[PDB]
Every structure is written in C-alpha cells, then in structure tokens.
Symmetry: D2
Subunit: 314 residues, 4 copies
C-alpha cells in the first residue's frame, strides 16, 4: 500500500534502486524523478509484471506532481566521486541538489520519510533537516541518512573471514559515513566473532575505505552503484515494513541524535509507524571502539556545521 519516490532515478544508483523497488510487493506506487532521461526509465520499468504503477517525471516543473501523496522519498540525486576525490569534494555540488529537492518534499510531502543517499551524508542530512525547519515542517523521526551499505559491507567481510552465511551475520556500524567516522562495532557482531587486534584493525580499515576501494576499481567510471541500490532498497524495505506494523525492525542510520555531543550520529534504530520508534544508542563497546568514537567526533562536528552554514546562505 506504499508510495515511494526516487529523486535522481536516472543515475547509476537511481535505476537499479528503482528496479528493486518496482520488484517489491511492498511498493504499490513508484514515482521517478530526475532532470534527465526519466520518461525512458519509467516506460522501461512499467513493463515489469508487478503491481506497482510506475510514473516518470522530468524537470523542476514536474517535481510537485511526483511528490504528491508520497509515503517515502529516496534521494540518490547527486554527483559521485572520481578516483582521488574525498566525499567532501562533492559538497558544493550536492548541497545545492539536496536543498532544492528536500524543499520540494517539505512543500508537497512533509509527512513522508526522507532517505538521503547523496554525499556527503554527514553534511547533507543537516541540510535536509534545516531546509525542513525553514519550511516549518521538521520531524527528526522521519529523516534518514542512509549508511546501510556500510553495514552490508561489514557483514560480507566478516562472513568471508569466518566462513559464515552473510545472511546470518549482523554488524552494527555507528558514527558517520566517511573515512574514520565509520566505526564497525565488531564486538557487537552477531554471531560473536573473535579476531586478534592484527586482523581486527585491517577489517576496520577495509570497511572504512570500502567506498574508495570500489571507486579505484571503476577507474573513473563512478562509485558503488549496484551494491548501493541493494542497500538503499534494503533500508526502504525495513522502513516500509515498520510502517506496516512489523515489529523488531532495527537499522543503523545517520539521524538527529542525543547519544553524543554530536547533534547528528548513526546508531541502531528501532523503526516503527512513527519512523524512528526508539534510538538504541552506542551500547557496550570495546576500548578500541571507544577510542575510534572519540577521534571521529571532531570531524563529525565540522561536517554538521558545514551543512547548517550552507542553509543559512540561501
């Protein structure tokens, strides 16, 4: 019974994301927006033999019609990295894109859940929050910075190393979504896994730099797209299941947080009909993980401020 909109639906991420969404019996209405190529993408997906009615929308003039009556909005719209770039080098470009798109959501679907994929998530969620404030519709329980791909990677890597089924592995990942702000809580991993500090340090670095590993392997042809489409769909499915009253649905996401001195932080979250039902916090951690959290906060605060500062200048 759910209506989902994808803003940036024509991109590397947008298209496979929209495919996974079209395939799902959770979605009953799928609206697709972009500045380019949307009608062709929409006609393509509309042929798939599932119940979701698909409709494409092109240009800022048609953005309002797209957002009308939306339960959930996902935002891959944005520019991806090239080899060498940091996530921060994309800031100027993506800030503008996010501000414009979130404003429309604020005006035309303020009760919707907003899932921002565009980078850097550490700054673009603050932008989304303030933009919603500036239109007087802010609800911190419905704005999500999608960090799911970090969890998905953590699970895959730990599964590979221990020879486990990655469907049975669950690694909480907290903090933010860039470099050393990504903190894998291997001590909270289910099932429990024992590593020497040797491997545990590499495993942590592997998770932190996984996004850059992929950018290097694509040699200028973009960043993670297919895996991100999987993670983005997974998060939307969790969210939509929770909104149908499924119980015990937990996902980590970058949101408005009380858990630290940082006003935005990613922790595991109990999702429900409200959006965020309850924030489960950092919980019990190892010294090594405590350390990483302390180091990450400086950088996190800078990125949050940078986002709030940008909204002031509109």
């Amino acid at each position: 019974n759910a209506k989902v909109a994808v803003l940036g639906a024509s991109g590397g991420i947008g298209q496979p994301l929209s495919l996974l969404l079209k395939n799902s019996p959770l979605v009953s209405r799928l609206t697709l927006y972009d500045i380019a190529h949307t009608p062709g993408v929409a006609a393509d997906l509309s042929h798939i033999e599932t119940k979701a009615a698909v409709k494409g929308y092109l240009g800022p003039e048609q953005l309002p019609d797209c957002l009308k009556g939306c339960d959930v909005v996902v935002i891959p719209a944005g520019v991806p990295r090239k080899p060498g770039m940091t996530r921060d080098d994309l800031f100027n470009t993506n800030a503008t894109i996010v501000a414009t798109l979130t404003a429309a959501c604020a005006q035309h679907c303020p009760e919707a859940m907003i899932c921002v994929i565009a980078n850097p998530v550490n700054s673009t969620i603050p932008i989304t929050a303030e933009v919603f404030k500036k239109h007087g519709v802010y609800n911190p329980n419905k704005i999500f910075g999608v960090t799911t791909l970090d969890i998905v990677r953590a699970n895959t890597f730990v599964a590979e190393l221990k020879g486990l089924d990655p469907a049975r592995v669950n690694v909480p990942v907290i903090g933010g979504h860039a470099g050393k702000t990504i903190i894998p809580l291997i001590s909270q991993c289910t099932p429990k896994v024992d590593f020497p500090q040797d491997q545990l340090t590499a495993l942590t670095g592997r998770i932190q730099e996984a996004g850059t590993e992929v950018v290097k392997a694509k040699a200028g042809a973009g960043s993670a797209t297919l895996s991100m489409a999987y993670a983005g769909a997974r998060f939307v499915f969790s969210l939509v299941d929770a909104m149908n009253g499924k119980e015990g649905v937990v996902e980590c996401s970058f949101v408005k947080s009380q858990e630290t001195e940082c006003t935005y932080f990613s922790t595991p979250l109990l999702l429900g009909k409200k959006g965020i039902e309850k924030n489960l916090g950092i919980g019990k951690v190892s010294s090594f993980e405590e350390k990483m959290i302390s180091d990450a906060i400086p950088e996190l605060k800078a990125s949050i401020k940078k986002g709030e500062d940008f909204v002031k200048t509109l």
Copy 2:
C-alpha cells in the same frame, strides 16, 4: 548451487542483471565478463551480503576462466537500438559478437544452458546453434533465445486492462522476438480474459511494439534495460529451479523447433534437469492468432536463413 556466467556484464542490461543474480540464493557463483569495466562491476557487487562469490573477467584472455564450470551462461552483450532502427539493423554488429562469445561457450562450457538476449534473437539463435554444430557439441535442449520480456509485457498489459494482479496473470507468447513475429496467445491466458475486438487488437499491437515504444521514450539513450534484466533473471531462475528438480516449470523461449515449418520458433517449454523436457507446442489458438502465425513465418524464415548464412560465410 547454480554457477552462472554473464557475458556483456558491464552494459545496461548486464549490470542490473548481474545484481538480480547476485541477490538470488539460487546462485552460488557469478562470473562476469566484458571487454571493458568488468572489474569495477565485480568489486561493487562483491560487497552485497549474499552467498554468491562474484568474479570479474576482462578481455579475451580471461573469457575461458569466466566460463569454466558454469551451469548457465547469459549473453546480453551487443549493441542496442536507436530510434528508427529495427532489431535487424543491429545484425551485422551483433552477429560477430554472438559468434565469438558462443564459440567460447561451445569450447569451455558445452554442457551449460546458453541464454541469448543479444538482438536480433530471430537470427542470433540460429547463429549460436550453427557455432555449436561446427564445434560438435550442439544440444538443442540447452540453447534458448530469451523471449521472456514479451511474456512479462503481455502479463502487465493484460492485468492493467482488466484490473488484475500481474503476478497472477500468465500469457503465452509464441513465434519470434521482432514486430509481427511476436504472437501473444491471449486466448490461452490464465485467467481466461475476454476483450472486445478493438481492445484485443490494440493490446496485441502494444505488446508487439513494446520494445520500439521504449526506444522512442529513451530518445537515443538505448533500449529496455531494467525490465530486460528482470526478464532474463526470471528466465535464469526458472532454468535453475528445473535443474534442481522442480516440476511444472514452463517458460516460452525461441528454440530449435518442429512446431511449424520454421526451424526455430518460440512456444511454451516444460523445463527439466537437462534443459527442455518437452516442447508444449502451439496448442489450440483462435483464428485471429492463426492469422498472425501465417503472417510471421515468412519473416521468421528469412531471419533464420540470414543467421545460418552468416556462419556459412566463414
């Protein structure tokens, strides 16, 4: 336990196709091949938290390693249509691509199911079979021209018209995969549907020009990609199920046929452990449908001969 190869994995069809395969618990190994970009696509997909081991291969030297030990090979490689073009206009381009890649399959995984997506299917399948004949390993029960998207479209359109759930609609589609060679047997639809003639005619034509409809909408950005990924994945899963012993798996597909005077033809096929268990044939059709079959045989024969001739001229 299925080991699947995708040849043309970096393209518009191949990337999302590879994603759907990677997500499936039916696939235990996913080997990807292309002449460009493959290692980035594999890196990206390798991070998804499912059991299938992903491996990328690039260039002719690496093709035999992609194909070794494979149960199924999907071949979406090939040049897509631009607006105005027929599928036949791609022939000279794609004939060489398909001949080369099928020669490699015949050499390195002769016992695999070979699923050709590359257009024009009405000609590229005959090419595939003649290549396997020159290598002395032609098994006509394992070579499939993937027509599944024509069935997926038919199901969607019928359901849209009658207000049904498309998951519950099943339209056999026969003949070939180009214009008037696409023959949707609406009279054999489950559930039985009755349409006034004017609606039945418009529906039948819409199914036939569905691909051309998507090319127009995309305005030179290519042909159907996301829905073709859906259709090819569906077909591969059907094949794998049947290989795992599942009973009553029926899919339409353009194969070696003696149902009409055409050497190749698409009809419903019961699949089993060794590919085609039984060609279920045309069955009983309406006169309208009888007329489209008569009208399609000339074009089909020409396209078959065209393909056979290409392998002759070598």
Copy 3:
C-alpha cells in the same frame, strides 16, 4: 558574411564542424540546431574571438527560428556506424532524420544551399530532393552530398606513397559515397603519379574502405568525426567563396547529374554564385577506372531508388 546553419550541431561531427565554422572570417551568423545539448555548445563557441554571432536552438519547436535567413545549411545530424555495420543499416534511422530536417529547410529557408553529410549519402540526397520536390522548391543546383572526405583521404594516401606535400595534391573522386561506388580517378591526379597495378589496386581499396577502417579503430566509439569536420568545413568554405563570387572554385560533390544513367552522381563541379555553375563531368579515364564506373552503377541505382521510395511512404 555567410549565414550558416548546422543541423545536428551537438554531435561528434557537429561540434568540431561548428568550431571550424566559428573560426572562419567567412561566417557572420552561426546558428546551431540539435535535439539535445545545443545551449551548452553555443555558449561554449560564443566565447571565441571571431565575429560570427552564435545562437543555439533546441528541439523541433525552435528549428524554424534556426533556419531563418540562412544562406548555407549543413546537416551532419544522424546516427554513426558501429563496428561491422554497413551504411545501409543506418538507413531507417537517418532517412527519417534527414527527411524531417530537409522538410523544414524547404519550408523555412528554400533558397539556401543544402549540404547533407548524413549517411547513406547515396540515398539521403535523393530523399532531400524528393522532399524539396514535394514542397515545390526543388533547385538541383543547391543540394549537395558531401563526398569531400573521400577526396581529402585520397590526397593524403597519394602523398604518403609519393612522399609529396598533401597540400599541393588534388585527386578527383567520382561516383558515390559507399564501398565500390567511391571511384578515385588516380589517372587525373595533379601532380601526375605512376603506380604499378597492384599498388593502384591497394590504394583505391584503401580509399573505398577508409570510413570502415576508422570505425574499426574507434572500436565502438563511433565513426569519423574530426576529419569529417575538416572535410565538411572545406566544402562549406569552397561553396561560400563561390557565392561571394570567386572564380574557378571546383569541388567534387554528389548531386543531381545527367552524366550517366544514374540520376544522381558525383563529379568535379564548378561552383558559382547560384550553386552549381557547371558540372565538369567524368572527363578522360583509364581502362581500370571505366571498369569501376560500370560496376558501380547498379549499386548507386538501388540506393537512389531506396531513398526515393522512402519519401513516397510519407
């Protein structure tokens, strides 16, 4: 002070062609048309320090404006070959394009010189003509099939073999613009050059399949663009000098001709103030060249007919 229009200006040929035209003191107004990207291209060129004013038009609504008051119109618009394709494979797409564009030329700038680059030239010129006849403004002295790249190539290939300065070389080339219809009259080359038969065969072969050797080297990335931008510019410059009144300006081009039983043919044309001043005809040829002319007529006649018969279906 010639007013030139480039239809298809955002393309691989269209862009560098537009650069060469912008760079010329002959051009006072450069109007650029395409269905995509034309505003960015126009803005780009408008920064160049030449006097030509640049204006960019987008989509068929703005096509009339683009052609208003034009003296010469260049049509590189169309779709390029991929490896393996013949020029004939592009017929369906490009015939529709040329017919649509030349229809507006005929409506909005009937007096202008019309230079068609879009392949297959052997068919697209007849189309242009039959479209102009249909609007009752056909002037056979103003419609040119741009065969210049053949000449340019021939000059270069002769000069590499005789170690000559290609600037001083002039080989006339007659017939059409596809495979065996391209007839390089080496016997009429200035300066005079003597080759044994085997070298004369291989040289002529090289000239005929040069387009295809470039399509192979580009390996999917399209056909000749830069050298066709050069050849196109040269012809437009030649044409314009004559319109200003320069005496003795001769360029080979594929036009309505009565030299052979083929109703369209390429020969050296003396250009003047009203288009073609005088068709200079074949002239003196060798035995080898008479063999090639006679062998070529059947293929030209067919391509001429395909083009003519296409306009009837409109």
Copy 4:
C-alpha cells in the same frame, strides 16, 4: 616543423585541440596520448590532408614513446567540473594525473615546452615545476599554465560591447585562472576603451566567472571544450612561431614569476626560442585593477602552497 604531444587527447578538449593542431602547417608530428580511445582518434585525424604525421598511444606503457623527441607537450588530461563545483574541488583527482604525466615528460622530453591545461591551473603548474625539480631538469622558461581562454573571453565581451571586430582587440589578463584571481586589465586594452565603473565591474565579473557560466549552460555535460581547444591551439601556435624565431609574439600565461610576491603569476610574456624571452610585467594599472591584484594574492599563495605540498607527499 614542430613536434607536438597531446596528453588527454581523447577528451572533450583534446579531440578538437588535436584537430586544430593537425590543421596547422606549423606541426610536423602530432603524437596523441590517453588511457582510452586514442587509436581511433589518431586514425580519424591521419586522414586529413595536411603534413602532420599523426600517431596514437595508449596507457602508461606507451607514454614514453609518445614523448620522445617532442618540442611541445600540451596537457588537457584531467577531470572537468560539474555545475556547483569549484576548480579547486578537482585538485585531489587532477593533481595525481598531472604529477604522473609531467613525471614522464621530465624523463623522456625534459627540454620540451610544457603547457598545462588541466585544472586547477593555479596549483597544477606548481606541481609540474616541483616534479621537474625532483628529476633535476627544471627550466622555468619552458613551463606554462594556459590562461589563454581568459584573454579570448575578455577580447570577445569587450568587442561585443563596443561593436568592434574581436580579432582587432587585445585585453591583457593577469594573476591566475580561478575566480577573483582572473584580473583583466581593461585599462591596457587595445584599442583603448573606457566604461563607466558600473559597466566595468559587470564586465570584469563576466570574465571572471565565464567558465562557470559554460558549465551552467551545459547542465552536467562538462566544461568549455571547443573554446578551450581554440585558446590552447592559439597558445601552442604562438609558442611554435616564437620557437621558429618569430618576433613580437606576446601571450599571457601562468608561469614562474617575481613580478609579485607570488612565486607563480600570469602576465604578458614575450616568447622566443628558449620559451620565455622576457616577462613584460604587470605594467601601469588603474586603482580598480591594483585593488583586485591585492585581493587576489592570498588565494594564489594558497593554491600555489597546495600544489607544492602535494609533491612533498610523493
């Protein structure tokens, strides 16, 4: 008789750049280099009827042979801006490229004139200089940051406002190549022009942000390509004319400088057979212009520092 190398020859700038170079009798050998597509660009150009011997090279393995015996090396190789990006957001990506290409130049053609187009120019020239210093072959008279397009834009806008022929206009532009650092000395224009302060500030603004405007106009399709090919060809031509002993050849360019407290700076340059013959200096400037210089200096210093610091990390 000059032997020019183009690194990044397959790009949007590189291809038209390479064309203009091939069209000049000043060039005897044009070696083209890229990581992709160069063979097909080379073949395309090799057909043009001018004397330049064209040769394609592909991948870091062939780079050394591209550079042997070269007189001028031009480096447009790099990533262009998207809308909203500053030239400096490209630093991390383009620094690595420039450092690697210039490293090869230092080993294989240390005596050649090095013309860097890659952005951000304010930092890439320092990178080149320091890479050349590491290999003990630094000559500050031979390393140029192509600011030429800034001058070409200044000429054009001034010529539009005063109804002049832009070919008879020269505005010196000084400082650097990014935002406020671009300082067009309108007071030193020839022929003399004077604008009211309100028109003068707007003109100055238009020149400073001209590159960003073309990016805006292209809506994500890249940055200025054709005009940059013009500006870069112009510069190489000036540099080759002077190398042949021509006199009175003056071009602005960002080079090693002591005209200000900036260690690198752009001012008009007298060019001769050793490269830089004489720095002509800033000259007499208005209050408005002197103020812009003062404001600019801290930004240039930072950009220069950024580049130097990068090479210390290798």
